[PDB]
Amino acid sequence: SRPILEVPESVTGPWRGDVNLPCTYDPLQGYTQVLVRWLVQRGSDPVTIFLRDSSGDHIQQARYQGRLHVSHRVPGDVSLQLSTLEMDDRSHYTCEVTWQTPDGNQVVRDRITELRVQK
């Protein structure tokens, strides 16, 4: 049918350690991945923390540049890796993927996960 994102409802990571927030899908013929975004919930509009598009990976905030990476090697795996976890990294995160079909249409799917940080 259409691509199905798989994102666990919650993940727990170690304080000062590293965690992977899984976000994966099985690739489907005729669906080309054109955008990945990861967002975090803070105030009154989701914060964009990562984008991958035709020009590469974009991590605009100094607080994340150097401690945020997104999986790339296996098609369909766009999991977020966050290193040196802070207690205020506890939040809800959105994984959002956009695909383009041969007719030129684009379809967007997203899922939210909760990261808990454990001492």
Ranges of each domain in the chain: 1-119
Q: Which two tokens stand for residue 44?
A: 């009154």
Bridge partners (DSSP) listed for residue 37: 51, 96
Q: What would the 3-class secondary structure string for 19-53 be?
A: EEECCECCCCCCCEEEEEEEEECCCCCCEEEEEEE
From the list 40, 41, 87, the residue with the least C-alpha distance to 68 is 40
Sheet arrangement for strand 80-82? 19-21, 80-82, 68-70
Residue with tokens 């995160």: 93
Q: Are 71 and 64 in contact (CB under 8 A)?
A: no
Using CB atoms within 10 A of its CB, is residue 7 exposed (0-12), middle (13-18) or buried (19+)?
A: buried
The residues, any chain, with a CB within 8 Å of residue 91's CB and separated by 6 or more, are 40, 41, 42, 114, 115
Quoted resolution (Å): 1.3
From the list 63, 115, 83, the residue with the least C-alpha distance to 16 is 83
CA pair distance 2, 12, nearest whole angstrom: 29
